[PDB]
Write an enzyme that holds these catalytic residues in place. Sequence first.
Site, mmCIF file in Angstrom:
data_model
loop_
_atom_site.group_PDB
_atom_site.id
_atom_site.type_symbol
_atom_site.label_atom_id
_atom_site.label_comp_id
_atom_site.label_asym_id
_atom_site.label_seq_id
_atom_site.Cartn_x
_atom_site.Cartn_y
_atom_site.Cartn_z
ATOM 1 N N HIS A 80 11.027 -4.246 -13.117
ATOM 2 C CA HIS A 80 11.432 -4.145 -14.519
ATOM 3 C C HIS A 80 12.074 -2.814 -14.900
ATOM 4 O O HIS A 80 12.614 -2.713 -16.006
ATOM 5 C CB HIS A 80 10.228 -4.402 -15.422
ATOM 6 C CG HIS A 80 9.963 -5.852 -15.666
ATOM 7 N ND1 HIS A 80 10.848 -6.840 -15.295
ATOM 8 C CD2 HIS A 80 8.910 -6.485 -16.234
ATOM 9 C CE1 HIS A 80 10.354 -8.019 -15.626
ATOM 10 N NE2 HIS A 80 9.179 -7.831 -16.198
ATOM 11 N N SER A 87 17.415 -6.600 -12.568
ATOM 12 C CA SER A 87 17.503 -7.794 -11.742
ATOM 13 C C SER A 87 18.917 -7.955 -11.203
ATOM 14 O O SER A 87 19.899 -7.624 -11.875
ATOM 15 C CB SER A 87 17.105 -9.045 -12.531
ATOM 16 O OG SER A 87 15.959 -8.801 -13.326
HETATM 17 C C1 HEM Z 1 4.558 -13.252 -3.360
HETATM 18 C C2 HEM Z 1 5.448 -14.150 -3.795
HETATM 19 C C3 HEM Z 1 6.488 -13.617 -4.682
HETATM 20 C C4 HEM Z 1 6.494 -13.660 -6.036
HETATM 21 C C5 HEM Z 1 5.449 -14.285 -6.923
HETATM 22 C C6 HEM Z 1 7.675 -13.005 -6.461
HETATM 23 C C7 HEM Z 1 7.982 -12.899 -7.819
HETATM 24 C C8 HEM Z 1 9.234 -12.497 -8.228
HETATM 25 C C9 HEM Z 1 9.742 -12.583 -9.532
HETATM 26 C C10 HEM Z 1 9.011 -13.156 -10.717
HETATM 27 C C11 HEM Z 1 11.003 -12.073 -9.520
HETATM 28 C C12 HEM Z 1 11.912 -11.963 -10.718
HETATM 29 C C13 HEM Z 1 12.749 -13.231 -10.902
HETATM 30 C C14 HEM Z 1 14.040 -13.056 -10.159
HETATM 31 O O1 HEM Z 1 14.880 -12.073 -10.517
HETATM 32 O O2 HEM Z 1 14.300 -13.784 -9.235
HETATM 33 C C15 HEM Z 1 11.290 -11.656 -8.200
HETATM 34 C C16 HEM Z 1 12.480 -11.075 -7.799
HETATM 35 C C17 HEM Z 1 12.645 -10.424 -6.580
HETATM 36 N N1 HEM Z 1 11.821 -10.499 -5.535
HETATM 37 FE FE1 HEM Z 1 10.111 -11.543 -5.476
HETATM 38 N N2 HEM Z 1 8.375 -12.563 -5.399
HETATM 39 C C18 HEM Z 1 7.716 -12.899 -4.279
HETATM 40 C C19 HEM Z 1 8.066 -12.679 -2.948
HETATM 41 C C20 HEM Z 1 9.066 -11.787 -2.625
HETATM 42 C C21 HEM Z 1 9.320 -11.304 -1.348
HETATM 43 C C22 HEM Z 1 8.573 -11.725 -0.119
HETATM 44 C C23 HEM Z 1 10.372 -10.416 -1.442
HETATM 45 C C24 HEM Z 1 10.982 -9.658 -0.336
HETATM 46 C C25 HEM Z 1 11.869 -10.245 0.459
HETATM 47 C C26 HEM Z 1 10.761 -10.371 -2.809
HETATM 48 C C27 HEM Z 1 11.774 -9.575 -3.285
HETATM 49 C C28 HEM Z 1 12.307 -9.759 -4.552
HETATM 50 C C29 HEM Z 1 13.556 -9.136 -4.968
HETATM 51 C C30 HEM Z 1 14.345 -8.230 -4.061
HETATM 52 C C31 HEM Z 1 13.796 -9.558 -6.240
HETATM 53 C C32 HEM Z 1 14.942 -9.196 -7.168
HETATM 54 C C33 HEM Z 1 16.355 -9.672 -6.809
HETATM 55 C C34 HEM Z 1 16.494 -11.157 -6.960
HETATM 56 O O3 HEM Z 1 15.700 -11.772 -7.625
HETATM 57 O O4 HEM Z 1 17.507 -11.781 -6.350
HETATM 58 N N3 HEM Z 1 9.942 -11.228 -3.508
HETATM 59 N N4 HEM Z 1 10.184 -11.933 -7.430
#
Ligand code: HEM
Lengths: 297, 125, 79, 48, 380, 380, 51, 80, 56
Positions: free
Chosen positions: E201, E205
Site C-alpha cells: 500500500h 499496485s
Molecule cells: C499468500 C497468498 C497471497 C495473497 C493472499 C496475496 C494477496 C495479494 C493482494 C490482495 C494483492 C493486491 C491485489 C493485486 O494488486 O493484485 C497482491 C498483489 C501482489 N502480490 Fe500477492 N498474495 C499472495 C501471494 C503472493 C506471492 C506468492 C507473491 C510473490 C510472487 C505475491 C506478490 C504480489 C505482488 C508482486 C503484487 C503486486 C503486483 C500485482 O498485483 O500484479 N503475492 N497480493
Amino acid sequence: FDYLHATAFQGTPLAQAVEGPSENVRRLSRTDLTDYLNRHYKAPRMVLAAAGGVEHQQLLDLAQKHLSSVSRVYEEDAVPGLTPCRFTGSEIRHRDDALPLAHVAIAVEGPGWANPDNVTLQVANAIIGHYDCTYGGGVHLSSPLASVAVANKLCQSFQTFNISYSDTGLLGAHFVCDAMSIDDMVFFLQGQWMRLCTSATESEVTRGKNILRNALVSHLDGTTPVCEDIGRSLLTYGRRIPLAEWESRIQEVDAQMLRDICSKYFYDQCPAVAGYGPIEQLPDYNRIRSGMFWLRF
Amino acid sequence: KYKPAPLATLPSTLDPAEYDVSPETRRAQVERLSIRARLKREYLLQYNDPKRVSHIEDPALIRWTYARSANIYPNFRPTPKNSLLGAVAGFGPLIFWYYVFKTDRDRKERLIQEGKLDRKFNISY
Amino acid sequence: REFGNLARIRHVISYSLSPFEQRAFPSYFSKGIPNVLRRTRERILRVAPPFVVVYLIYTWGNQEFEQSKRKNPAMYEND
Amino acid sequence: SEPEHDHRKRMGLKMLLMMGLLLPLTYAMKRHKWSVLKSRKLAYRPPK
Amino acid sequence: MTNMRKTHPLFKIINHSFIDLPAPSNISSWWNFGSLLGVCLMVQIITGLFLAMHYTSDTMTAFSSVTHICRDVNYGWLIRYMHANGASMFFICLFLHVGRGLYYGSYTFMETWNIGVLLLFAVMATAFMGYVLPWGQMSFWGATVITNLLSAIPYIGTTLVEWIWGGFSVDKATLTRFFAFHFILPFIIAALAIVHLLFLHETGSNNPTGLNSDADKIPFHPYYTIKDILGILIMFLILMTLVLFFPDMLGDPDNYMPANPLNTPPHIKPEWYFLFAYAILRSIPNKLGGVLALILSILILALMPFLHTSKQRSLMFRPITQILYWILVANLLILTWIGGQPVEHPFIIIGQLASISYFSIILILMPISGIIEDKMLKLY
Amino acid sequence: MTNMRKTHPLFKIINHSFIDLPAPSNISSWWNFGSLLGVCLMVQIITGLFLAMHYTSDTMTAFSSVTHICRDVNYGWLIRYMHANGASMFFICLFLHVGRGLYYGSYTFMETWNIGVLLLFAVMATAFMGYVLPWGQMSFWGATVITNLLSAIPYIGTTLVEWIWGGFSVDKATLTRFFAFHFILPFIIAALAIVHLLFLHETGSNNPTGLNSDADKIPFHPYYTIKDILGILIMFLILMTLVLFFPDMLGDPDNYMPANPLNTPPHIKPEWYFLFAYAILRSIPNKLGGVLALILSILILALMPFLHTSKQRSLMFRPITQILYWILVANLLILTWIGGQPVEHPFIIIGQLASISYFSIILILMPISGIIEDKMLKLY
Amino acid sequence: LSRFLGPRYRELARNWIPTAGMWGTVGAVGLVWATDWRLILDWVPYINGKF
Amino acid sequence: SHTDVKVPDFSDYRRAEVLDSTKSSKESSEARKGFSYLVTATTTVGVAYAAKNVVSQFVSSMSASADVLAMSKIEIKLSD
Amino acid sequence: PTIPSRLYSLLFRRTSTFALTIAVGALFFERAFDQGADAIYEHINEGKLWKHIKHK
Ligand code: HEM
Ligand code: HEM
Ligand code: HEM
Ligand code: HEM
C-alpha cells in the site's frame, strides 16, 4: 458553468456557450448576423421594461411612435421552435494541477421556469445556502455545510444555484476548494443535501422561507434588477408574478412538502459534474452516485 | 402520445421536425420543389411531344434495376460481420434440417427394423 | 500516498456519462468478438507453440511409456 | 463409497441453476459499474 | 459533524485499504487473484474450522474420524471435499498469482515479493502438513518420502528427521504434531497477508502496461469490489464444480485406503501442486542436490528481483521475454506432468532436461533476453 | 542517508507503536499488565503449540493423551502445567488490568473498552472451552453444568444446547468442537488485541492522575521496554513458581480422574476465574435470571463509559469513590469465595447480599459518589 | 438525552418512524427466512404444505 | 478556450430511450433505474441464497451427527 | 409509466423497500427454486431415486 452546460445537455442546443467557440467566431460574417437579427429579434418575443419614474400611457404612446412595427411575420413562414433538451448526467474534469484552486460544480436537472416548484426547490437551495471565505460568521453560521467547511477548513467558497430554463434547469452547488478536500466537500455536500432530503425540519424550512423572502425583496429592491425580473418574468412566466403571490407560494411550503418533492428532484438522480483545477481528489462518478443515495434510507 | 415505429412511422403533420423549421430547411424545400419542377417539366415535355412514338425511358428506374441486378458483387467488400451472417444464413438451417431429417429417419428406420411401426394399409409408398 | 498528491497532469479533460443513461453491455456479442479475436491474434503466437510442444512431449512420453511397457518380440524369442 | 451422491448431484444442479441465473446478472452489474470507465472518452487541450 | 471513514481509525484502515485505495484503472482479471487468494484462504480457514469439529488425530481413528466426517455427520462430505478442492483452488490462484507477477514484471516490489515468497513457503508447509491428516496410504508414504528427503542434509539431517518425526518413523506423534502445525500455519499466512498488503500500500499496485500510473487512478470501491464479487463468483463456480461434480480426480485414490506400513504403493506421489517439486527433487541422483535444488527452485522467485535487467517493467512490450515466459510456463507444466510417474525410460531424461531448462530459462536466458531486448529497442 | 525506522513501513509501525510512542512518564507497575497480557497470551499460544502436538482429541483417549503428555512426553508436564498456571497468570493479569481500568479513569477510552469487553468475553469462552479438554470428571460435569445453564431460555434454549453439544450430552463431537474452538479463539483474541492497541494508539495512553499528559512525554524505548522486561521477569517469577512448585494448587484436584458420566462430584465447581461468574449465576433463583445476571455481570463494566458522572477523570483524587472501588473488589473476592463454596444455607444469602451490593456499587452508588465528589468540591 | 429531547428531534424522529419500522420488518422477515420458523412459515400459503 | 470543449458523440453507448435529443431523460429515468436496480436485486436474491444456504449447511454440520441421532433413541421397552 | 417505472417509484427507490423486496423475493425464491430444482432433478431421473421405488 460553461463546462457544466456543455456536459449536462450534450447533443442539445444548450450545450453551446453564449459566446461561441473560437472556430465559430472567425467565420461569422454580416449576412449570418442579419439572418439572426431577422429571425430571433421578432417583436412579440420582445418586452419593454421600465420600472419607476415613468407613466405607462406615456410609454405606450412612445412605443406606438417608435417601437411599433418592428417585425412580426417570418420570411418563409419558418417559425423557430423550442425543444425539450436532454439532461445527461455526466462528468467532465479539466485537470490542471499547477492551477491553485479547484472549481467543482455538481448539478441535478431541476423543473425550470414554467413549472410551479421553483419556490420549493429554491427554499431547499437556500437552506443549503452559500459561503465565501470573507464571511465573518465563522463556525456559528446557520448552514451546516458552511459550518462543517469552516470547522474543518474544507473549501474557500461554495455557491448553491438554481439556474432555470424553459422546462430544464440546473440546480446544484459549485465550490472553490483546495486540492485536498474535494472528497470531503463532495461527501458533506451530498450528506447535507440528503440530510435535508430525509430529515427536513420546520425550523430549517422557516429559516429558508425567511431567507428566500429577504433574498427576493433584496433582489427586487433596485430598479435595474427589478427590470431584470420584469423582463425575465414576462419572457418566461407569461405573466409577471407579483411578490404577494410569491409570498402566497412561499407560505404554503412545509417540511413534508419539501421532503417529497426533494425525493422527486434529488433522490437517486444522476448529476452533472464539472471541474477545473486539481480534480484528482474528486471522487469518481460511481462514488458520487454511491454517495448520493443513502445507506440507511 | 403516439409512439413511433419503424413499421408504423410518424406522420409529417405530427412530426416535431415540421414545426421548428429553419430558412435553410425552407430553402431545401424550395430546391426540392425546383428539382421536382425540372423533372416534371422534362417528363411532361416528353409526354406531350407528338413526335415521340416509343415509351418513356425512365433513368432512375434503369438505375434501380441496375443497382438491384448488377452492382452488388462489384460493390462487395468482404467484412467479418457479412461473412459470419452469410455463413450462418447459408449453412445453419442445412445442419438444422439435417438433424431433423436424420433424427426422424433414424427413428423411422429403427421402428421399422424393430417392428413397432406398422404399415397397415400402405401400398403406394 | 492518497488522492490529490499522486501526480501532476495538466491540460487533460475527461468526458464521462452515467452508468444508468448508457447500456450496461455496449455492443457485446457483435463488436466484442473482433476485439477478442484481435487480442487472440496479438498474443497467440507467443502463447501457443509452447503449448504445441507441451502436447508433443506429452504424446512422446505416453507413447514411449506404452512402447517400453510392452515387451519386444526380437530378443528371447528364438533363445 | 458415496452415500451423499444423489444429494451431491441435486445440490450441484441447484448450484448450476443458481449460477446460471446469477453470473450474467453480476457480470451485468460489473459492466454497469464499469460503463463509466468503458465510455470515459479523453481529450487533450494544450495551451499552444 | 465529521467524516466517519476518514475519522474512525478502524474505518481509516479499511478506507485506505479497500474503499478509497488509489488503484490503477488498467488492471485485468489476473490482478483479481490476490483478493481471490485472500477470500479462498478465508474460506479454507472457515472450512477447516468447521472440519476440525469432528476430526480426531491419532494413529488408530484418524481415518475413522475422516470417514465419520464424510458420511456420519450432517453434510460433512461437502466440507471435506470443499477443503480438498479448495486447497487445489488455493494453489491454482497462487500459481496464477505467481505467474501474474512473472507475467507483468512486478519484481521491483522487492519486500512485497519477499513477503510473498515467505507466504509460498508457509502455504507449501501447511499443505504438506495437511495432506497427512486423512491417515491413508498415499498420505503416510508421501509424508514418509518427503520427510525422508531431509536426511540428505549432512551431519544434522537425520537428527532433524527424528526431530520432526518425534520417533523412529511417521506415527501418532507425527500426525498430531502435523495437525497442530496445519492448524496454526494459516494464521501465520493471514498475518503475512496483512503485512503483504502493508508493503503493497505504500509502493502502489502494478498495471498490465507496467508504468507509474498515478495520473490515471480510480478508487477501489465500487469498481474493484464489484470485480472482486465477479471473480469470487467465477472462482466459486470452478470450486463448486470441483467439489460437487468431480470431487476426487485431483486427489489421489490411494488416500482412501487405510494406512499401513506393511504394504507400500508402487507409485509414490503427492497431490498435484507438489508434482513440480517432486520433478525437481527426482532429477538429480544426489539427494542433497535434490534438496538444494528444491529450496533454490522455490527461492529463485525471491532472487528474481536481481534479474531485472531490461529498462521496461512489464513483459507485455517484451516479445522475446514473452516467448521465454510461456516456454517457462509450459516447462512448469512439463514438471507437473512428469512428477507423478515412476523413474522409467525416458522420463528421467525428460525430467533432467526439464529441470536444467527450468533453471536455465530463469538464470541466464531471461536476463540476456532483456539485454537483447534493450539493444534491439535502442536503450544502449 | 535515511532513517530505517521511519522509512521502512513495518519498521515505521513498529517504531510508532513500540519505540518512540508518546507515553506518560508517571505510570505505575499497574500499567505493565497490558504488555504482560500480550506476552502471557504469546506464552499461552506457544505452550499450546507445544501442547497440542501430542494431544489427541476424542473421549476414549483424551485423558490418556494428557497423562501421556505429563509422563511419557519429555518435558511435557512443564508445558501442560505451565499452560494451566499460565491461564491462571493470564486471568490474574487480566483481572488486575480490568481493575486498573475501573480504577484510573480509563472508562472514557470508549471503543478501546468495548473491544476490550468483546475480548474479555472471548477470553472467558476460550478458557472454559479449553478447560473441558483434559476430559476429567470435573471438566465434563463443569461443561455439562455451564452449557446446561444456557438452556434456561425458552424456544431457542434446547436448540442452542443441542447445537453447542452435538448430542443429548457432552461427547466426542463436543470435545473435538471445543478443541477446534480452543485452537481458533486466542488468535482472534490476539488480532483483537492488535486492533485494541490501534484504538489505544489513536489517542495515546493515560496517566494515573487523570490529566492531559501531552506536556510531559518520554519515548517508549528504552524507558518502558526495560520496565516491560522487569515486569516480564517478575511475571515469569510468579508463573514459574506456580508451575515448578505449586502446580495443582490454583487448579482443581478433582479434574485428575478419568471422566465418567455415571457419577457426580459431591460439589460441582468451575475454575477460579469463573467462580464469581458461578456465584452470580447461583445468586438468582430463576435460571434465566441467572444467565441474564451472567451476561449483565460481564457486560456491566462496559456501561462504565456511560456511568462517568464526575468531572474528575481518575480515582486518584476521589477518596470515597476509592472506598466504593475497594468495596467492589472486596465484593469480587467474596464472590470468588462464595462460588468456591458449595450450595448450602447460609452461603446462598451471603452470595445474594454480595451480588446485590456489587451491582449496587457498579450501578447505583458510584455515580452518586461522583455527584457527591463534585458537590463537595463546589463544582456546581 | 437532555439535549436530545426537544420538538425538532421529535419531528426528526417522526420523520424517521416509517423507514426504521420498515427496516425492523426487514430484519424480522430476514430472521424468519434465515431460521425457518415453523409457526410463521406454516401461515404463508406458498410454503403451506410441508416445507 | 473553454467554449471550444464539446462532449463527443455518445450514440454507440447510450440507451434508445435517451438517444433522441428532442426528449427529456426524466420520462425514462425511472425506467432505466428500475431496470438496473432489478438487475441488482436479482443478483442480490441469489447472493442471499448463497449466504443463507451455505450458512445453513455449516450450522447443520455444527449440529448433531446422524450416528448420534441413531444412538440417541433409546431401546424400546415394548409390551413386556 | 412503463413496466419497471412504477415498481421503481414504489418499491426500489428507498433502501428499506429495496431490502423488503429482496427478503420477500428471497422467501419466494427459496420455495419456488427448491420446487423447480427438485422437479427438474426428478425429471432427470424419475425411477432411480428412493421416491417411486418406495412401493416395497
Ligand atoms: C499468500 C497468498 C497471497 C495473497 C493472499 C496475496 C494477496 C495479494 C493482494 C490482495 C494483492 C493486491 C491485489 C493485486 O494488486 O493484485 C497482491 C498483489 C501482489 N502480490 Fe500477492 N498474495 C499472495 C501471494 C503472493 C506471492 C506468492 C507473491 C510473490 C510472487 C505475491 C506478490 C504480489 C505482488 C508482486 C503484487 C503486486 C503486483 C500485482 O498485483 O500484479 N503475492 N497480493
Ligand atoms: C487453519 C485452517 C485449517 C484447518 C483447521 C485445517 C484443518 C484440516 C483438517 C482437520 C484436515 C483433515 C480432514 C480432511 O480433510 O480429511 C485437513 C485436510 C487438508 N487440508 Fe486443511 N486446514 C486448514 C487450512 C488449510 C489450508 C489453507 C490448506 C491449503 C494449503 C489446507 C490443505 C489441506 C489439504 C490438502 C488437506 C487434505 C485433504 C484431503 O485429502 O482430505 N488446509 N485440514
Ligand atoms: C488480554 C489481552 C489484552 C492485551 C494484550 C492488552 C494490551 C494492552 C496494552 C499493550 C495496553 C497499553 C499499556 C502499555 O503498553 O503500557 C493496554 C492498555 C489498556 N487496555 Fe488493554 N489489553 C488487554 C485486555 C484489555 C481488556 C480486557 C480491556 C478492557 C477492560 C482493556 C482495556 C485497556 C485500557 C482502557 C487501556 C488504557 C489504560 C492503560 O494503559 O492501562 N485491555 N492494553
Ligand atoms: C491458541 C493457543 C492455545 C492453544 C493451541 C491451546 C491448546 C490447548 C490444549 C491442547 C489443551 C489441552 C491440554 C491440557 O489438558 O492442558 C489446553 C488446555 C487448556 N487451555 Fe489452552 N490453548 C491455547 C490458549 C489458551 C489460552 C489463551 C488460555 C487461557 C484463557 C488457555 C487455557 C487453557 C486451560 C485452562 C486449559 C485446561 C488446562 C488443564 O486443565 O489441563 N489456553 N489448551
